[PDB]
Design a binder for this molecule. Structure first.
Ligand SMILES: [Mg+2]
Ligand SMILES: [Mg+2]
Ligand SMILES: [Mg+2]
Ligand SMILES: [Mg+2]
Lengths: 226, 196, 204, 195, 222, 232, 212, 195, 196
């Protein structure tokens, strides 16, 4: 997994690859790692995939209720405080490593949080097995006062470094851009540089190739009238 | 990590490097290890980042609630709350915390709380992995009732040496000055302190 | 010792044109010892199908649990649960045992009764959803299944072509796994007819 | 405990269970009956850890007898086996699990069919024509796979069972002191007193 | 504690035709989640119309290939430049491998060539020298992904003739070198999709009576 | 079997159109203690080869002496020692690779990762890696330790495959190497600012640069960073 | 793995399965588990594949040297003992071997020695070794007679491996049959278990539990 | 191996040794003779680790036979037992010790006396009226302590031996498949073929 | 243990504490850790006392035999012999040795040989458990070409601080001065150096 977050002029951008693995085996080639905590607060998760999904949805759920209770749009610091206190309580047993980014009435924000509950602030961050490859790119090209277009470019380049160089990362680049005073734009499969080439052969079988012992209709309908 | 707090004539100054490592990888080279638990009561954190952050947040909460009821807490009171958390949860914590604050009655005060959760009031304190390399230097160079400029130089030179020898320390030298005049943040970059 | 490979077995699911297929082997064993050749691993609640590999006691327990829950769902909702909703229910149910999990590899397959869209999904033992467009694999020969599916699969297969593809994927994967085989079942699922076929295979 | 075998024939279920009770160095008993009658037409044999086997078996027996009195009705073998499986499936994630493997031989009076269920201590249930627990299957299943027919008489079942026991007595290192054999059919449960 | 072994990933595949044999392998070399090289040759021409690959721990793989190449050289010196037949090479490799029975070459070795009747031959070894002549053998990381596919598409396993419904097997008709190469390419393309250690490039060595030929194909680099 | 004591970190290198570049910092770490600040970890052999060594420094000094002895030995009864029968990068590597594998096979390794960079007699670039296990591999870019994780991604953006090598000038290659050294200084806790860089070119020969420093560093953005979440 | 050998009126029957596994992964279905030591002697493979292959090939070399030096066929007793003495030297080092050395000489008649990597050497009439040995013993014990015909004995060995191949997860692939006579062994073919199972089920009426 | 018993009566030594050979799960043989004749009037039974037992026994046999030929003379049972003890005492501090326990039953033709020696794998030698190795003594010694007389006939020795074996067959968990019994007296060594 | 060697204008000076501990017990409070391997080639020993003594004795033997054949050995040669023993026997040794010597051609030279058996030629070197506390101080206060009196003060002050913070160090500060004039032994007692 390679995940990055990059601050820019009027907001923040987050990006991720789309490979999920079981050891050395690729389970899903187009995984969605960019998660929505609230409309304009998004985060990307590395580590235990279900811990990243579950902790997002739980805090996302509570953030929504909090927003309704206070009649205010959710803040990134609230999502952060709720995430870290939940993760700290479980002493790293919930293996969620997240980059949390968003915009709110206070402004634009970018944070990282690790499984044990420690958080960090930054203008550029990377997480996952391809974080070192990504951070190499970020440390080479990041500057203050990036534009939206520059930040999207830098973020996706950092993910690409992970895709090509990290075996844990691959396939596509997902991006989400959160700009102040605008709707957050989720760009699913922003880049697609790993389409499989056409195979040499079609492996469609002739009908009746498989040996069959018994056939029967399965009753999926409910008990019928009359 | 290299952290220290030093009392001087007009109050106290906290100092820290900015390096946070995961093994040999520098996970954050611009970390802020100087944390505010009250207006003029700050702390330097060493050990588990999760633990020291959790502790600091709880202390900040306690001092906020204290202030609402009883007014501004003393630095000693803040140190006591830190100690209570560290001592009672010693089995599950890895935290080494220096507490520094400015009263008008007591002026600059420094309390160090090492791993066990004991408290020690000192004229100055050093902690973190990098502190080992500057026990000799700090002991030889510290004087009581230094000026602001002298104390800044003392901390700058000390943390410079800690950074030079300790791989776990590095980045910028952050400092927070606590006096009657208010709260001042200082930062010093490698090109400055490496040539000292 | 490893709970996910005591009993053995495999499930595979595929999508086709206006249809889905889900298939499983029939073996239950105690490590090297073959115990049953009639242990079906696919179940259904209304029109939603659920395959479950892994520790057999959990396979049985989860089937009973999801029958339980989908029956209450139906009584309250006054309608049969859909594949998308059920997938979330499986995920939720598995994650609630985060630190004492069912040692299973569930696979959902079905067609949404309102949109007509074919749906498949896979899970790890604590509920992480894998919602693949093409195919989902699970069990002690998941590597072999991945290899078969990746080469044999092509999109938009007609029901009777999809049958051959999924059958051959299962059979040949199972024959390279000691703990899978002893018979196989393939469900071909269309919007309002489901056909169930038992396959002839080697019994070693 | 050691060897427990089961075979479902045409009109009955036959359970064979070893008589030996060994506590480490010595064989303390050679006439132990590793079975409990759960209801008039349902018998359960068991094997596993010492103490837990009998404790579990009697606990199940009490529960089924309680159900029988409350409803004035005998639960089907299938229903009893499902109850037993749940108890074991509950037990495996307990603080200290029942280390008990069972065979449930019952005659369903409604369907007029014999039924044999094999359940291990994990709560792994399977309905079988013949079954075993432990190493018993390793020696006997090749003989049962060969000779078994679904239309066998009770007498033929007993003869096939004898061949299985003979093979066990030949190739097993442990002396299990023979077996007690019990037949479950429409008339209830009875013990074959010469085997 | 010092671990004398490592895992350099990689996947190899040997297929014996009627009058030819191919030995293929990906060119990616790895440790853990890093790529060492996108092109590090793994299948080697060892002379006497024999090709060899020792997949697994690359240091032992290189050592073994080197010692076998050396054995070919000395076979010529000692036996009047006699050609080392594939069966003789195979037996010789067993002794090389079993010589380190108690500190093994951590590799899965495959050799390919032609037998003394000119028919395609592939031999497969375990780390300690047990070996067999085989028609079809994948080795390394993605072997479990490739072999079932080969069982189905080379040996036509579980395939029956339409209309007979399981009564008549699909006949085992001989495959051409072009047909085998298609199956090799599709095997590695599929393996590249689902296995993280497979990718970058595919190098195939083809052995016929005319000699050894090479073919290279790009694989996905992610 | 041992454990490394005094250690050197990343060695990084790449090929360019007319030769190879190799670089390594001048630090000898003693665990987390940055003990020795003037350690040369690039060792030239003749005028055509530079051997870059990371890992255990005591073993590095031993290897350094083996290479010194190799030059002496090659000159014995060799009228063409400074011509046709001079040591080639490929000879030097193969010798080291033999030693490394032999040592691991006796369960007594030289605890090092080594990159031999040089130019052959025919002008061909030579760049190959060997480590304590005797594992060897070649690539357009090679790096050890942290450099493998952080330098390679950057260097591979310049030379991604073999066909990129003729398109890469010495200026572009050196620029990429120097930037990588800066990135490693930012992110490797066992690195130093001071490093050495060697260029072996088929035309201009061996250029050995000592006392280089990481410069043009970005730190100013640190002033705005406050707290770890909610602090203002 | 399942290997067996038994003595009878017509000599020795040797029958083996063909499966090799690494964990749950089936590495091969075409493993030769009968090692042709020479035209008169057979050995079976169980435990370590390399250990059995290597040392029983080596045994063939020692047998050949014996008959060159002594101008006489080596006895099964002497041949088996060369192997058992050799593996006994390596005891503790981690050799894995469970084999039947099978032969038929003038002085001995049909003879089988179970040889094993912890130094055991046992002469016997029926031996079964491997993960599926218990299944094969059941069929052997209940059907074995000395006065079996060569045809019936061959089938009994085949059927016993099939019984194991069915029940034992780590046995299967195919059955290899050998008949050892005084004038040498005779190979009786490779029999795919998949096809053999259905054939035997129908013709014999066995395996009623399995639907076909 | 398992049970080896010895009893020295008036005019002979009787050695009883189990017939079973078990390799873990299966009983591979039920007719194994766990004994070697070292000389015409000296017999040695043995039990211990697989392989080492026979290797040691045959090694001793070869050595005694070599001595017999060289000197044209049969060593006394005492002399043979001392040779064997030294070999085991040497073995216990070796790189890999012989894990073999033996009983040496001999008739001394010079003294006209039967003699039974018990030696364990450490080289612990004792001359006894009756002896055993492993757990065999635990079951049998109470019977031998009660019934044994130094003036017993060979037939009475065999009857007391039967009672010992019967007790073993009752209380031992393992099936050792009966025993082979051999008698050593002035006329040499013979096997009781019905026991 | 706290040991150091410092080159200066007229040659080199070796310095050491005198504490030898077995756990927390001081087995010897007046140890001589400055050892003579040749007339003007000495060494400071740290690590296993058995190992460093054995090594030093072997070196002394080697240099004595060297001298009989080839005349006075260089300090480099002595360091090389130390290194050969330490490197080749690294698995079985726990020795950290500083080698200091005076030639007339080369003047004062210092070589440090840490645990692994590597050699490092330095202007000055510090070693032993107590050295950790004075990396900062020594780095800040060392100058090249100091006078004899300045170097004695530098070593005295440095080892004073090492002793102050390290429990494993203590007792007297021993020093050996190596110049063209000859070999001078110095000793400094606690009452002197503790008040610095
Ligand atoms: Mg530093
Ligand atoms: Mg199978
Ligand atoms: Mg890949
Ligand atoms: Mg099988």
């Amino acid at each position: 997994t390679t995940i990055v977050g990059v601050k820019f002029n009027n907001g923040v951008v987050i990006a991720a690859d789309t490979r999920s693995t079981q050891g050395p085996i690729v389970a899903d080639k187009n995984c969605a790692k960019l998660h929505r905590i609230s409309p304009k607060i998004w985060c990307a998760g590395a580590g235990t995939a279900a811990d990243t999904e579950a902790v997002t949805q739980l805090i996302g759920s509570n953030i929504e209720l909090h927003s309704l209770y206070t009649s205010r749009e959710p803040r990134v610091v609230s999502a952060l405080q709720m995430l870290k206190q939940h993760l700290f309580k479980y002493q790293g047993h919930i293996g969620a490593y997240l980059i949390v980014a968003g915009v709110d009435p206070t402004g634009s924000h970018l944070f990282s949080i690790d499984a044990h509950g420690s958080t960090d602030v930054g203008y550029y961050l990377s997480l996952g097995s391809g974080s070192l490859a990504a951070m190499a790119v970020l440390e080479s090209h990041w500057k203050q006062d990036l534009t939206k277009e520059e930040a999207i470019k830098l973020a996706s380049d950092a993910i690409q470094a992970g895709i090509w160089n990290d075996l844990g990362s691959g396939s596509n680049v997902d991006v989400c851009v959160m700009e102040i005073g605008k709707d957050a734009e989720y760009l699913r499969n922003y880049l697609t540089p790993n389409v499989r080439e056409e195979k040499q052969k079609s492996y469609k079988f002739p009908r009746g190739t498989t040996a069959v012992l018994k056939e029967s209709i399965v009753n999926i309908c409910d008990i019928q009238e009359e | 990590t290299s952290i220290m707090a030093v009392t001087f004539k007009d109050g106290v100054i906290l100092g820290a490097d900015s390096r946070t490592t995961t093994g040999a990888y520098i996970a954050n080279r611009v970390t802020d290890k100087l944390t505010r638990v009250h207006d003029k009561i700050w702390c330097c954190r060493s050990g588990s980042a999760a633990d020291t952050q959790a502790i600091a947040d709880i202390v900040q909460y306690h001092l906020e609630l204290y202030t609402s009821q009883y007014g501004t807490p003393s630095t000693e009171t803040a140190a006591s709350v830190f100690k209570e958390l560290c001592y009672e949860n010693k089995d599950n914590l890895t935290a080494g915390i220096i507490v520094a604050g400015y009263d008008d009655k007591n002026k600059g005060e420094v309390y160090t709380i090492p791993l066990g959760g004991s408290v020690h009031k000192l004229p100055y304190a050093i902690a973190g992995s990098g502190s080992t390399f500057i026990y000799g230097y700090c002991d030889k160079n510290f004087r009581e009732n230094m000026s602001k400029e002298e104390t800044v130089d003392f901390i700058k030179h000390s943390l410079s040496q800690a950074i030079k020898w300790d791989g776990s320390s590095g980045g910028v030298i952050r400092m927070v000055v606590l006096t009657a005049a208010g709260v001042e943040r200082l930062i010093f970059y490698p090109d400055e302190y490496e040539q000292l | 010792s490893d709970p996910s490979s005591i009993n053995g077995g495999i499930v595979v699911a595929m999508t086709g044109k206006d249809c889905v297929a889900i298939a499983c082997d029939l073996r239950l064993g105690s490590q090297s010892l073959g115990v049953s050749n009639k242990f079906e691993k696919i179940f259904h609640y209304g029109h939603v199908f659920l395959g479950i590999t892994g520790l057999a006691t959990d396979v049985t327990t989860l089937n009973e649990m999801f029958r339980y829950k989908t029956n209450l769902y139906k009584l309250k909702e006054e309608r049969a649960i859909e594949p998308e909703t059920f997938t979330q229910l499986v995920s939720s149910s598995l994650y609630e045992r985060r630190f004492g999990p069912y040692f299973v590899g569930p696979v959902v397959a079905g067609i949404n009764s309102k949109s007509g869209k074919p749906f498949i999904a896979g899970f790890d033992l604590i509920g992480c959803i894998d919602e693949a467009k093409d195919f989902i694999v699970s069990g002690t020969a998941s590597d072999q299944l991945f290899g078969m599916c990746e080469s044999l699969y092509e999109p938009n297969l007609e029901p009777e072509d999809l049958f051959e593809t999924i059958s051959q994927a299962l059979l040949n994967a199972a024959d390279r796994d000691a703990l899978s085989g002893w018979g196989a079942v393939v469900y071909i699922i269309k919007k309002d007819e489901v056909v169930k076929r038992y396959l002839k295979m080697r019994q070693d | 405990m050691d060897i427990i075998l089961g075979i479902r024939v045409q009109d009955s279920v036959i359970l064979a269970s070893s008589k030996a009770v060994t506590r480490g160095i010595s064989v303390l008993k050679d006439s132990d009956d590793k079975t409990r009658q759960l209801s008039p037409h349902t018998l359960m044999s068991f094997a596993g850890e010492a103490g837990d086997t009998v404790q579990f078996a009697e606990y199940i027996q009490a529960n089924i007898q309680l159900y029988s009195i409350r409803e004035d009705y005998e639960l089907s073998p299938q229903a009893v086996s499902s109850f037993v499986r749940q108890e074991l499936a509950k037990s495996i994630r307990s603080r200290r699990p029942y280390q008990v493997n069972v065979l449930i031989g019952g005659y369903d009076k409604k369907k007029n069919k014999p039924e044999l269920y094999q359940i291990d201590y994990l709560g792994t249930k399977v309905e079988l024509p013949y079954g075993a627990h432990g190493y018993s299957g390793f020696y006997t299943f090749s003989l049962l796979d060969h000779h078994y027919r679904p239309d066998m008489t009770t007498e033929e079942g007993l003869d096939l069972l004898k061949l299985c026991v003979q093979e066990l007595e030949k190739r097993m290192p442990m002396d299990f002191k023979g077996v007690i054999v019990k037949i479950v059919d429409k008339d209830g449960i009875r013990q074959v007193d010469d085997f | 504690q010092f671990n004398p072994y490592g895992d350099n990933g990689g996947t190899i595949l040997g297929i014996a035709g009627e009058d030819f044999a191919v030995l293929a392998g990906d060119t990616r070399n790895i440790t853990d989640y890093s790529i060492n090289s996108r092109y590090e040759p793994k299948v080697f021409d060892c002379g006497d119309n024999i090709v060899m690959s020792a997949n697994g721990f690359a240091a032992d793989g290189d050592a073994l290939v080197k010692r076998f190449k050396n054995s070919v050289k000395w076979y010529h010196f000692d036996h009047n430049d006699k050609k080392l037949s594939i069966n003789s090479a195979a037996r010789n490799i067993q002794h090389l491998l079993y010589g380190k029975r108690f500190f093994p070459y951590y590799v899965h070795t495959i050799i390919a060539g032609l037998d003394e009747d000119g028919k395609g031959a592939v031999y497969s070894f375990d780390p300690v020298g047990s070996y067999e002549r085989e028609q079809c053998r994948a080795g390394g990381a993605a072997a479990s992904l490739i072999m079932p596919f080969l069982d189905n598409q080379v040996n036509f396993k579980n395939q029956y003739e339409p209309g007979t419904n399981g009564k008549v097997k699909k006949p085992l008709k001989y495959l051409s070198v072009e047909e085998v190469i298609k199956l090799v390419r599709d095997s590695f393309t599929s393996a590249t999709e689902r296995h993280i250690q497979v990718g970058d490039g595919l190098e195939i060595l083809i052995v016929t009576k005319d000699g050894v030929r090479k073919e290279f194909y790009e694989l996905k680099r992610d | 079997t041992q454990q490394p004591i005094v250690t050197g970190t990343s060695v990084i290198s790449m090929k360019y159109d007319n030769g190879v570049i190799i670089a390594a910092d001048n630090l000898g770490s003693y665990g987390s203690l940055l003990r020795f600040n003037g350690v040369e970890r690039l060792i030239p052999v003749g005028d055509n080869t530079v051997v870059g060594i990371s890992g255990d420094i005591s073993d590095m000094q031993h290897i350094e002496r083996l290479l010194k002895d190799l030059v002496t030995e090659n000159a014995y009864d060799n009228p063409l020692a400074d011509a046709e029968e001079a040591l080639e990068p490929s000879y030097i590597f193969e010798y080291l690779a033999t030693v490394m594998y032999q040592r691991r096979s006796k369960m007594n390794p030289l605890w090092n990762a080594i990159i031999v960079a040089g130019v052959q007699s025919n002008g061909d670039q030579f760049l190959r890696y060997v480590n304590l296990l005797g594992v060897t591999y070649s690539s357009p870019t090679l790096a050890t330790g942290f450099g493998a994780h952080m330098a390679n991604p950057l260097l591979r953006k310049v030379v991604d495959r073999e066909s990129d090598i003729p398109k890469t000038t010495v200026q572009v290659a050196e620029e990429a190497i120097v930037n990588a050294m800066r990135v490693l200084y930012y992110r490797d806790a066992r690195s130093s600012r001071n490093f050495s860089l060697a260029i072996i070119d088929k035309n201009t020969g061996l250029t050995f640069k000592k006392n280089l420093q990481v410069e043009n560093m970005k730190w100013d953005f640190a002033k705005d960073i406050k707290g770890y979440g909610t602090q203002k | 793995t399942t290997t067996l050998a038994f003595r009878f009126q017509g000599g020795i029957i040797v029958a083996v399965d063909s499966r090799a596994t690494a964990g749950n992964w089936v590495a091969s279905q075409t493993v030769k588990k009968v090692i042709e030591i020479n035209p008169f002697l057979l050995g079976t493979m169980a435990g370590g594949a390399a250990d059995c292959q290597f040392w029983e090939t080596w045994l063939g070399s020692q047998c050949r040297l014996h008959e060159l030096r002594e101008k006489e066929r080596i006895s099964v007793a002497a041949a088996s003992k060369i192997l058992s003495n050799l593996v006994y030297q390596y005891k503790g080092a981690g050799l894995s071997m469970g084999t039947m050395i099978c032969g038929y000489t003038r002085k001995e008649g049909p003879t089988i020695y179970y040889v094993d990597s912890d130094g055991t050497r046992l002469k016997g009439d029926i031996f079964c070794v491997g993960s599926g040995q218990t299944f094969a013993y059941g069929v052997l014990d209940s059907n074995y007679k000395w006065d079996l015909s060569v045809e019936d004995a061959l089938y009994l060995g085949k059927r016993s491996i099939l019984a194991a191949a069915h029940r034992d997860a780590y046995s299967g692939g195919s059955v290899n049959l050998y008949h050892v006579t005084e004038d040498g062994w005779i190979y009786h073919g490779n029999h795919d278990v998949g096809e053999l199972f259905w054939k035997v089920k129908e013709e014999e009426g066995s395996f009623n539990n399995v639907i076909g």
